[PDB]
Amino acid sequence: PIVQVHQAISPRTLNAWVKVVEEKAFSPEVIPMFSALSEGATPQDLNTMLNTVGGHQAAMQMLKETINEEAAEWDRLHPVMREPRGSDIAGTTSTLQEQIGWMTHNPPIPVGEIYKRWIILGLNKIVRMYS
């Protein structure tokens, strides 16, 4: 996350989270916990976390599809320092430096916060699917 500059979530925190998500798989109480954990997150942070958490293969694919759908919608709503496109917000086509750039620009585009809402949309769809 960006702190008072960028620093990775600590390994101890991420590894503990992996176990929490496993124990609480597919339950909605994970969602607010995700929001708390990812305070200040860049898209790079978020992808490291998602990749570390891993989990259920079909669920991961559904999350990915949801993200891609939201990135497409972002491009429709906000066609394009350069401005980020959907894939930049998802951290696919952007660097960590670029993400920090947008997040701290005057005025800013909070690419981490935007990506978080896409991830949360996916997590909610997953909750319903496995309920």
Ligand X SMILES: CCN1C(=O)[C@H](c2cc(O)cc(-c3cccnc3)c2)C(=O)N(c2ccccc2)c2cc(C(F)(F)F)ccc21
Ligand Y SMILES: O=C(O)c1ccc(-c2ccc3c(c2)nc(-c2cn[nH]c2-c2cccc(Cl)c2)n3CCCn2ccnc2)cc1
Residues at the contact surface with ligand X, assessed by CB under 6 A: 21-22, 25-27, 30, 34, 50, 53, 55-56, 59-60, 63, 119, 123, 126-127
- Region of 6 on the Ramachandran plot (φ > 0 left; ψ -120 to 50 alpha; else beta): beta
CA atoms within 13 A on the CB side of 13: 13
Residue 53's binding partner among ligand X, ligand Y, none (Cβ under 5 to 8 angstroms by kind) is ligand X
Bridge partners for 6 per DSSP: 2
Rank residues 36 and 80 by Cβ distance to ligand Y and give the closer one: 80
Q: Residue with CB nearest ligand Y?
A: 105
Q: How far is the CB of 54 from ligand Y (least distance, A)?
A: 28
Residue 30 touches which member of ligand Y, ligand X, none, C-beta under 5-8 Å by kind: ligand X
The tokens for 92 are 């696919």
Report what 59 binds from ligand X, ligand Y, none; CB cut-off 5-8 Å by kind.
Answer: ligand X
Q: What is the dihedral of CA 81, 86, 92, 98, to 10 degrees?
A: 20
